[PDB]
Structures are given as structure tokens and as C-alpha cells.
Design a protein around this ligand. Sequence first.
Ligand SMILES: [Ca+2]
Ligand SMILES: [Ca+2]
Ligand SMILES: [Ca+2]
Ligand SMILES: [Ca+2]
Ligand SMILES: [Ca+2]
Ligand SMILES: [Ca+2]
Ligand SMILES: [Ca+2]
Ligand SMILES: [Ca+2]
Lengths: 206, 206, 206, 206, 206
Amino acid sequence: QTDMSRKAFVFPKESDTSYVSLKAPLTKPLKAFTVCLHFYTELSSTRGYSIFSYATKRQDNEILIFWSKDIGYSFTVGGSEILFEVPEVTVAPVHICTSWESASGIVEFWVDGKPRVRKSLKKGYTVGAEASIILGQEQDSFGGNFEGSQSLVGDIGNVNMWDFVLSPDEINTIYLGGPFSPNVLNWRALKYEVQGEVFTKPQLWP
Amino acid sequence: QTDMSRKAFVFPKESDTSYVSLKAPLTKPLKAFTVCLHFYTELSSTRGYSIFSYATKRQDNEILIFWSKDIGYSFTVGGSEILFEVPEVTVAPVHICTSWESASGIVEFWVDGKPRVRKSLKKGYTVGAEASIILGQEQDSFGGNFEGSQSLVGDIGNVNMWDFVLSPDEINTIYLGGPFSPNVLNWRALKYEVQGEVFTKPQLWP
Amino acid sequence: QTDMSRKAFVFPKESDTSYVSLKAPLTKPLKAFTVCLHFYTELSSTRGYSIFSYATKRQDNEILIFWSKDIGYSFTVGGSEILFEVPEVTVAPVHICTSWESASGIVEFWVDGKPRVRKSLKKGYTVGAEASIILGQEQDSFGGNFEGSQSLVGDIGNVNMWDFVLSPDEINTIYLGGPFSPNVLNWRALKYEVQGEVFTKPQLWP
Amino acid sequence: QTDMSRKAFVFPKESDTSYVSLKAPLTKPLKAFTVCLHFYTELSSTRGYSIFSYATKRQDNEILIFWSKDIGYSFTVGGSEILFEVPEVTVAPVHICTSWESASGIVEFWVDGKPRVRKSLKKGYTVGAEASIILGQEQDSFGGNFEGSQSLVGDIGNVNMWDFVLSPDEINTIYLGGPFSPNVLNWRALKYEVQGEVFTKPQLWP
Amino acid sequence: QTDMSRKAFVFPKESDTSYVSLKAPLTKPLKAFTVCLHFYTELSSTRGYSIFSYATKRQDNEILIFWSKDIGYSFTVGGSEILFEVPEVTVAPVHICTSWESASGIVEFWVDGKPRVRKSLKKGYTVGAEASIILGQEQDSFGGNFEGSQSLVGDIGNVNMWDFVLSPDEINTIYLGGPFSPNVLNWRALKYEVQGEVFTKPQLWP
Ligand SMILES: [Ca+2]
Ligand SMILES: [Ca+2]
Ligand SMILES: [Ca+2]
Ligand SMILES: [Ca+2]
Ligand SMILES: [Ca+2]
Ligand SMILES: [Ca+2]
Ligand SMILES: [Ca+2]
Ligand SMILES: [Ca+2]
């Protein structure tokens, strides 16, 4: 229950041990969701890394946002991957919002307030309710099995999550810095646990 | 009779079966026309696809707007094709308005509010009045014979059609979001029929 | 005596027969002149074409503005040519004003309101008073001998001509859409004769 | 005690002897610091050079900002180096602010008001209080041992230093020209000593 | 004693004979100076042109500004040269102001209101007072070159000269069109002599 406003978690060096665990008070299993966050790293040009890792006992990669070197954004839900190609990679903080809906399988990926085309993925599936949500490390087992070749080195912040799909207008205000209320993960009332070489400093992005 | 305002039809995956049929209450055969629409796809770089297919019992390709891979926009009326070359293809929603006039054969193609040069095509011809207008699939027979290699994968919306040629100023307000009244196909009073894997979601373009 | 305001002549297809003859009530032979016009074509990238052709019985190319493929603007007065190189060709309507002065031979070429350097050409010469001025075709004989490989395909409009040299400030208002009064060719009181496949439509440039 | 406002030190030619010594009234050893400055040189494309050299009797390179040819900014504190790669080098005045914190080892490097990612360097270390701070030359011994291959040729000015870490907002006003009060080195109340071919002229950057 | 305001000298063709001599009523020898001017030419072959040539009986190249496409700016004072090369080649009129100070040898070169780095050249030297100042051609007094000098082809104007070094703020107003008073060469009270194929026409730059 910490107001993480104007703050960001910063992982200064490549580790096997650093990560931040996010505690979500989930009761009902997810039939849709929207997760937005701000990250800033320099790895994009050399290796892949994990941005957001939502794992279940049954499925280690229930919902995962990853940057795969030389390709682009790799959005995977329920163990099934999908790609959002990004040819020219630029170094600057980046803000992403991604959403999925069981009813149609339509997944949207918004990078810096601008939408990528809509794709289909895991229609009819249903995301597990009890999960280990980790920032900065790649989960390969419920809350563990971290491969350092997929660790995040840089800053990450403003992570929020809704249990429904945000509309283009809402996704826009989130980007522009408008007022909103998440209902799963809330950066203004975040309940987390730090582990390793990770510090809390003022955010670099405005 | 549905107000499709702020909405778009979205074809999430490559199909042989998905399409949307538009019902136009046409009585008089067309001697000119203007059709404008907004589409957003990622196919441009790999294959060709059908944007707008107006077919008659006698002529399957009465009026057809198509993107032919590596070339550009392919505007065909009355079975006769014409090309609007587009070298550097970019991924972003795009808005096009195209018009034809029997009296001179002059066809204009406006991409994103800016006009391409005027070309001549099918002078003296006259477009059939009873037609099957389909979105997302390529007609090769009245209301059927769909080739999946020409299906549209992405969003399409704001389709409107006039039975006369819009002026540069009108075409401009349509683009900029001004008020106007179509007299053949009206996105604000659309009468359609969905078939297959196609959903109605909020438009991504502003 | 037609007010061609807000209009443009449009040559939709490659011809050997289409052109527009402009009638100028000239009495005194020219010792200087300024001719401005707006044109919009897509040929620039493939072939050369004639923009403005002023011919005399004695000299078929008394004053001629031409685009020679891969080089740039070719301004020729009195059979003698001069070049205004344009490396990167862009497709959009373009406005040009060009002027010549017998007294010094200084010829200016203004493209889109911005001046190219001053060059010398045909000093002391004197342009013939009785001439055939044609739009869209390349004259090789008084009022004839059209080579289709030099025809114009696109729109052309706002042609005006003065018997003196416009100053930078005047050339500027002409560009910006200010008020002025030509004294040879006047687009507001144009006296022309159409021949072939050429139509009069609303101008695409603002 | 000179108001160096609107002024810059200028080293016109490559020397072995030119430099400016800055006198800081330091009592407590540094546990953190922020140093900002403006420099403008043309060497970037041919050789490396010293921007800011803070030396102690025990450690000649206590805190040093250097540009290493073909690589980028080389920030070293306590003899330990770290790199901020800059691929495309541009010639224009540049403003940099850099900071370090013993408590975490986090070092920030801001170039022209925009932040580079955060890196870790010399955690737990503590910078010496009695030091020789030199501008324009590379120290390899307390107050001496200058290698001319690392001399600065150009202008340098607006150097300020704080004993704490400036926040993003503060670093921003410093850049934008807001009001602030340094507490180690103050360009408004600078106490220096010039040596060699160095002059004081009006700054070229705004 | 002519108000050359809003005018420019124009050399239409490559000559061996065309030039403009400027008469300066100098009494005291120069210990510093600032010379600004506007020129506009068509950066052609390796053959560059002389922009400003200030010659003495003793030294033919007392102060000379020379520009060649594939070289950049060559500023020479007292027979000794120095180079300022400008990267992006903009095809448009250009305005330069350059200054030198005997006391330090610092020479500044400002192109289009923006400063290039400060360099050292001819410290302690002193420019001759009785000189032949020529526009449009290099000046090598007592004859002796094997072949001609070959003149600038284009327009040149707004030449002014001060016997002291202009500050950044002054150099800025001169560029932006503010009011000032030269004290050696004054474009508002210019005393010149034309020779050859050179005309006085309205300036193309604003
Ligand atoms: Ca893993
Ligand atoms: Ca994994
Ligand atoms: Ca077909
Ligand atoms: Ca087909
Ligand atoms: Ca011909
Ligand atoms: Ca001819
Ligand atoms: Ca050294
Ligand atoms: Ca050293």
C-alpha cells in the first residue's frame, strides 16, 4: 500500500537475483485484461529481456510481455506467443499498454499512445487467478527459475492492470496522464516486495 | 439502420469465410460515384488484399479497390484496372476517397486528404445498379467465390458512398471530420450483414 | 474572356492530339517577360514533358519551359536552352514563375516561392510578338508538330504572363495569393481554345 | 569571486600548458555529487579529450568526464570507468549533467536535458575532499602531468557542482535556464586561476 | 555614397574580367575586424569562388574568405589559412559574419546566425590599412599568375565591415535585420566601382 507516484524501480546491473514481486488480490479468474507500464532500457540492441511476467502454478507464462532481440515485442498469453514487429529500435523511455479478451481472442498492443493492428490469440482461454507477478526477471516456475539472459537492466514503473479491456479513449488518457482507477494492479496503491539489487528512484520519463 | 459511428469492423485472422455485406438501396445505375473509407492493416508488406468489392451479376469487379503487393493501389471499375503507385509503404491507419465520372473517365484517388494525379478510365461506361457490396473479401461471383489470398486482416470502417463526384473541398471536410450526407452508403445509417469471424469494436484511428 | 478562377485544365491521358491554345493580344515584341503557372503531374520520374510552349513562325521554341527527365527544369528562350537542376523530384503540385530581361540576359527561376540562382541567357535578343502559345503539347512548328513523348499528363492552371520582370516581392504575393494584374496572359480573363481530350475541373492545389 | 555569467573560457589551440584551475572550499568528503557544464569542441571526430578533471593526492582520477574517440562519454569516479555510448556525433554546443551516489552506486548522465539510462559504479566509495579541479587538461598527478593528446580545444563554461544528487526536475530547470544555487562550484561566484593560452569571451551557446 | 539597401550585385556568368571594387577610407591599420555579407551561388565543380578579397601591396591575401563546395570555408588573414567546413549543403542564400582579433588570434565564423567553434590564427599580426577590396574575384596584385582568377557566379550583397569584433548579440541582430552602424564598409553608404559583366538587381534573400 505504497503510493509509487513519480517513482520507478531501477535495476542497475545484470543479475540472476534481482526482481520485484507484485501482489494482486485476485479472486476471480481473468476473462480479459489490460496492463500498461513504462520502461526504459538499453538492452534492445544486444539481447532479449522480460518486461512483465505473470505466472501460475500450472502455466509459468500465463501472460508475458517480452522484447525478443531483432524482432520486436513478444506478447504471450497462456503459453501461446504472438509478435509485434519493431524494425527500427530507438533508445528512449517507452510506454506500452496491451490488452486481451477471451471472448474474441483480440489482443491490442499500443506503443507510446499509438495502436498496432489487432491480432487474435487464445480465444476462449481463461487466465488463472492465483499468480506470481514479477518485474525484472523471467519466470520459468511459479515465483522462480530466473535466467539472467532475460533479466531487465534499466528502469520500469507506472505498472497498472485492469480486469477488462480499456477503450482507445481510456488508453489515451492513461498515456497523456489523465485520471483513472485500475482494479487489479494499482501503481498508486502498490503492494510489492523487492529482492536483490533494485532501488526506488524518481522516474526519468515525464 | 445502425449508427456505426466511432466503430470499425475488425477481421482478426486470415479467412476464406469472413466478410461483411453492405446493403445499398440503389434504383438508378451509377454514372459517377465517390467512395471513402478508413482501413488499417499490416498485410501491405507481404500480400495483396481487397479493400472494397462492388459486384454485379454481369460483372464481378464492377468497382474494386485493391492493394497489390509491391505496386500500390489498384482501382478498377467495370473490369478495367488502373494503378496508383505507392513505393514506400507505411504502417498506420490510412483514409482513402476515390471517385469516377462516366462523362470524362476522370478518376481521382485521394490518400490521407492529399490528391494523386487525375487519370482516365472507362469513359462512357455505366455502373450497374443491383450489386453485392462486400467488405473484407474479394468477390469473383455475385456474393461469393472468395479467395483467401485476397482477404483483409485488420480493421476497416467509415465507409461512405455518394452517387456523384465530391469536390476537393468536400473531400477535405470528409477527411478532417466535418459534417456531410452520403446518398448511397451511409456509415451513420448502415444496413449490413456480418458473416464469419468479424467483430465490431471501437475505431483505432481518431 | 472566361474567368478561369479556381479551375485547371486536366489532360487525363497521354495524347498526340490534346492541347489548349492561349490567345494573347500582343502588338509590341517582348524585351522582357514573367510567366507564372501551377502544374501537377506524375511523369517527372519516367519521361520529359512540355509545360509552356511559346512559338513564332520564325522560331518554334521562342520561349519554352520543359522538364527534362533526370535533370530538372529546362528554360529555353530564342532556341537557346539553360538548365535548372533538380536532383530529388517530389510528387505534389508545383508553382513556378520564370522571367527574362533582354537588357542583361538575366533569367530567374522561382520554384514554390523560393528563387534559384540568377543565370544569363540570350542578352540583347527580342522575343517575337505574333505567337502560338500552347499548353500541354510541345510545339515544333507554329501551332503544330506535336510529339506525344513530350505531352503533359496531369493538371495545369493559373497561367499568367507579364511583359516586364516581376520583383521578388511581387513574385511572392503571386505565390501567396495576393492581388495583381497581368498584362499579356490573364487567368481571370483567359481567351483560349481547347482541342482533344482536355477538361476543365476544379483545381487541386489551394 | 567572479560572476562568470554569460562568459566561457576558450582554449583556441592544442596545448600542453593551457588550463584553468577551479578552487572549491570543500571540507567534508563527497558521498554524492552532481556536476553540470556546457562545452563546445570540434575534436570529437578525431581524438579524445578531457572535459572535467577532479584529482586527489591519492587518486589522480577521482571524478573525470572524458570523450573517448569513437565510443562516447567516459564517466569515471574513483579510478573506475563507465561508458555512455554515443554513435552519431554532432558538432554543436552540448550541455551535460552527471551525478553519482555512494549509497547505491547509481550514476545518471544527462545530455542536453535528456537522460541516458542509470548505471551502477563505485557503490560505497567516498570521494576525497581536498582536490585539484582542472578545466581543459587531463590530470595524471595532483595538479599536473598533462598529456596534450587529451587537452580541450574549444569553449567550456557554465560549470557548477552540487554535493547532492539533482532530481530530474532540477536538472531540467538547470538546462532550461532556471534559478538555482550550487553548493560546491558556482559559476556565479567562481574562484579560479588561468594558466597558459586561455581567454574569457562571451558564450556562444544561448 | 550609394544606399545599396535591398540590392545585390549579380555576376551572371563565369568571367576573368567581372568584379566590384569597394573603397574604404581607412587610415589606421587593423588590429581586429568583423566582416559580414550575404551571398548566393551554385556550388558546382571543385572550382570554388572567392567571396571577399582584401589585398595590400605587400600581401595580396591580407584577409580573404573563400568557399569551395568540397572544402567548406577557407578563412585566411595575413597569408595564413584556416578551415571551417560546413556539413549539410543547403542550396539557398547564405549569410556569414567572420571576425579576427590580433590580441589573441581568436577568429569566429558565424554561418546563418549560428557560430562555428573559435580558432586561433595570426596572433599579434596587424592588417594593412591601404588596401584593394574586391568582390567577385581573388586579388593577386602585381600580376604573375599563369592563368586567370575566375570570378564568383551568383549574387552577393549586404557587405559591411567593422574595425572591432562584434559580440554574439550584435552578430545576431545583424543577422535578424536589426539596426547597426559599420565603421569601415557600410552597405548603406557604399562607395564602389563596377567593372565588367556585373549588374545591380533587387536582392533575392529577405
Ligand atoms: Ca526464462
Ligand atoms: Ca519464460
Ligand atoms: Ca475478382
Ligand atoms: Ca480473387
Ligand atoms: Ca518536340
Ligand atoms: Ca520544338
Ligand atoms: Ca592523462
Ligand atoms: Ca589521468
